[PDB]
Amino acid sequence: YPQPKVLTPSRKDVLVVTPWLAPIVWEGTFNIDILNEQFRLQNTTIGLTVFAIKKYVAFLKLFLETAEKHFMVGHRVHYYVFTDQPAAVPRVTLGTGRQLSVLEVGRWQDVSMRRMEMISDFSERRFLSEVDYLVSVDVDMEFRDHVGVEILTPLFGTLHPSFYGSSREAFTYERRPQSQAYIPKDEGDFYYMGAFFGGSVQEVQRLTRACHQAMMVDQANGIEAVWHDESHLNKYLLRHKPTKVLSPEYLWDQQLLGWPAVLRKLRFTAVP
Amino acid sequence: YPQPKVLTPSRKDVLVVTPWLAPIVWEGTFNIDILNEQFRLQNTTIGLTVFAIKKYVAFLKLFLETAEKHFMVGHRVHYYVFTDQPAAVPRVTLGTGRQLSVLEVGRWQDVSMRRMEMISDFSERRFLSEVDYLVSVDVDMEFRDHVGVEILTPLFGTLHPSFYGSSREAFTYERRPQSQAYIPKDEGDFYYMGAFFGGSVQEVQRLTRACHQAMMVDQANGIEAVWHDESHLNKYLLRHKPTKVLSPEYLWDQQLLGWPAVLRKLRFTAVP
Numbered sequence: 060y061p062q063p064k065v066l067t068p069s070r071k072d073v074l075v076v077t078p079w080l081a082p083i084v085w086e087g088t089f090n091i092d093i094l095n096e097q098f099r100l101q102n103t104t105i106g107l108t109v110f111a112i113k114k115y116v117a118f119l120k121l122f123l124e125t126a127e128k129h130f131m132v133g134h135r136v137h138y139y140v141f142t143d144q145p146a147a148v149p150r151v152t153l154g155t156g157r158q159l160s161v162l163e164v165g166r167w168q169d170v171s172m173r174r175m176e177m178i179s180d181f182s183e184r185r186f187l188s189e190v191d192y193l194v195s196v197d198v199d200m201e202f203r204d205h206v207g208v209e210i211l212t213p214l215f216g217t218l219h220p221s222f223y224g225s226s227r228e229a230f231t232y233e234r235r236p237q238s239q240a241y242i243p244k245d246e247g248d249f250y251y252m253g254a255f256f257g258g259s260v261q262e263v264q265r266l267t268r269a270c271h272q273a274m275m276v277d278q279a280n281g282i283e284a285v286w287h288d289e290s291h292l293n294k295y296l297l298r299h300k301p302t303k304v305l306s307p308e309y310l311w312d313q314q315l316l317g318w319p320a321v322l323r324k325l326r327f328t329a330v331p
Numbered sequence: 332y333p334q335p336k337v338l339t340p341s342r343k344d345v346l347v348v349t350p351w352l353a354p355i356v357w358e359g360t361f362n363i364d365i366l367n368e369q370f371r372l373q374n375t376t377i378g379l380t381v382f383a384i385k386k387y388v389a390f391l392k393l394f395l396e397t398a399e400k401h402f403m404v405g406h407r408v409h410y411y412v413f414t415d416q417p418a419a420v421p422r423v424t425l426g427t428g429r430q431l432s433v434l435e436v437g438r439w440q441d442v443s444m445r446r447m448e449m450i451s452d453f454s455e456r457r458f459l460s461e462v463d464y465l466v467s468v469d470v471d472m473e474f475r476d477h478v479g480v481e482i483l484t485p486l487f488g489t490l491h492p493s494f495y496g497s498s499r500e501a502f503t504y505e506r507r508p509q510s511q512a513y514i515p516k517d518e519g520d521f522y523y524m525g526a527f528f529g530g531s532v533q534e535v536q537r538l539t540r541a542c543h544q545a546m547m548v549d550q551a552n553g554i555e556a557v558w559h560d561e562s563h564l565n566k567y568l569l570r571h572k573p574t575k576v577l578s579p580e581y582l583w584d585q586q587l588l589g590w591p592a593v594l595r596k597l598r599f600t601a602v603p
């Protein structure tokens with residue numbers, strides 16, 4: 060493979076490492092053949108969690124067919140579909156070493172807390188025996204390009220595609236000191252999107268347990284953070300900084316935002 | 332602290348991440364206040380090993396006085412001085428939470444294998460109960476600027492200051508297939524210097540055990556790698572890629588190489 064070049068930046072146009080030295084994952088920053096090897100040597104299994112409740116079951120067929128084409132291909136994958144409609148999960152043919160489980164789910168407050176509470180419950184009992192990493196994403200999405208082991212790390216979040224260019228003042232953090240998710244006006248590294256985060260099983264157990272326990276405190280006090288579990292994810296990732304950050308290549312909406320020059324690939328995008 | 336800037340590279344002139352997403356540590360890539368916090372929260376202790384054999388005891392006074400001014404200040408440090416002359420170790424006053432132990436050492440083949448064999452022995456029995464990370468450096472050096480927790484990671488090596496600009500063909504890797512340290516002409520990421528490497532205790536136990544066991548094989552076969560334990564360190568770090576790489580700011584010789592523009596700081600330098 061090509062020799063890395065010490066006196067040429069892998070990118071001239073974007074930050075590729077955070078000020079706490081976590082990589083920011085853009086095309087042109089990684090050699091996938093090296094990463095695939097390192098992860099295959101550990102026989103890595105990736106768990107992918109997705110919620111498909113009420114009408115969202117309609118997004119599963121394309122989400123799964125495209126995941127089969129672009130997500131962790133060559134590695135072991137276990138999809139966990141959380142749904143209120145097990146009979147509406149489509150039977151998608153899977154590649155070798157890939158499996159899918161359906162987890163049936165049973166008041167808008169529990170609906171707001173559902174993702175973090177359910178991942179926390181299942182992460183303890185046990186995603187922990189079944190996978191090495193857990194990745195949580197939204198279901199109204201499709202994979203268009205490679206999303207692979209470059210993202211794997213103890214803890215990651217993803218730059219929200221509407222905010223990667225913004226000053227922190229513009230970030231839609233929870234701004235009321237009465238909320239657990241409160242971030243003051245002068246703090247904040249990045250604005251992470253709730254639609255794509257993950258990490259090792261242990262770090263995901265920690266994060267979801269924290270967010271779930273924080274949301275319950277908010278509820279008991281009659282406040283709901285401006286962007287619900289996303290507000291709390293952002294507070295969590297401020298205090299416990301992610302070990303990689305994914306660029307917006309990993310979470311994009313082409314209808315809303317087009318295809319700007321700093322994105323060399325659009326890997327995982329909103330469905331219209 | 333300042334908000335990271337997504338659309339501005341932390342550096343426009345150098346690579347700051349390897350193609351396996353390990354940071355390459357240059358000035359302007361890290362915020363030390365954030366890193367100091369994360370490491371203090373874990374009460375991190377860093378072990379620093381240095382050999383001072385025969386006339387090299389003469390380098391210890393300046394090496395230690397300058398380490399006190401610039402190495403891991405604010406964190407716990409344990410110096411381990413390996414020497415054939417315990418009475419020639421100078422009594423240098425140490426800052427709080429810092430300690431020094433003298434380890435007395437007892438045929439040019441064992442001399443060649445000494446660093447890796449001795450660190451491996453002591454790393455097992457036990458640096459392992461005393462520190463969280465181990466850093467190994469040469470003693471004929473002085474600290475001139477900050478060398479701190481930005482370097483800490485499971486496994487690191489440092490770019491040799493004579494080779495960071497070179498194509499791999501120019502790297503003085505061991506080139507004879509009869510050596511354990513053999514690297515072919517078309518392989519190699521970087522040329523790491525034997526004078527500054529480290530990592531977690533476990534990863535240093537592994538690396539030194541590997542290099543020691545490889546050198547013995549070479550000896551039994553009547554070959555000595557062109558650059559001795561450095562040749563083997565380079566073979567090791569090719570097959571087990573470091574999780575951070577330090578730039579040549581961390582290992583420089585101003586007499587030989589001057590002060591080029593890509594070095595914003597000269598942190599740890601050769602003594603004339």
Ligand SMILES: O=c1ccn([C@@H]2O[C@H](COP(=O)(O)OP(=O)(O)O)[C@@H](O)[C@H]2O)c(=O)[nH]1
Nearest residue numbers: 109110111112113114115196197198199254
């Ligand atoms: O009735 C619902 C509402 C939400 N969701 C899940 O939670 C995510 C967040 O929903 P939303 O579309 O509101 O997020 P947005 O992309 O519009 O900000 C969805 O992708 C689904 O995975 C669901 O399954 N059923």
Ligand SMILES: O=c1ccn([C@@H]2O[C@H](COP(=O)(O)OP(=O)(O)O)[C@@H](O)[C@H]2O)c(=O)[nH]1
Nearest residue numbers: 381382383384385386387468469470471526
């Ligand atoms: O007689 C010796 C030879 C070597 N060393 C140690 O091993 C390192 C490597 O020595 P050398 O000066 O040859 O390395 P160089 O910087 O010249 O490449 C030295 O810094 C010392 O720490 C020592 O203590 N006594």
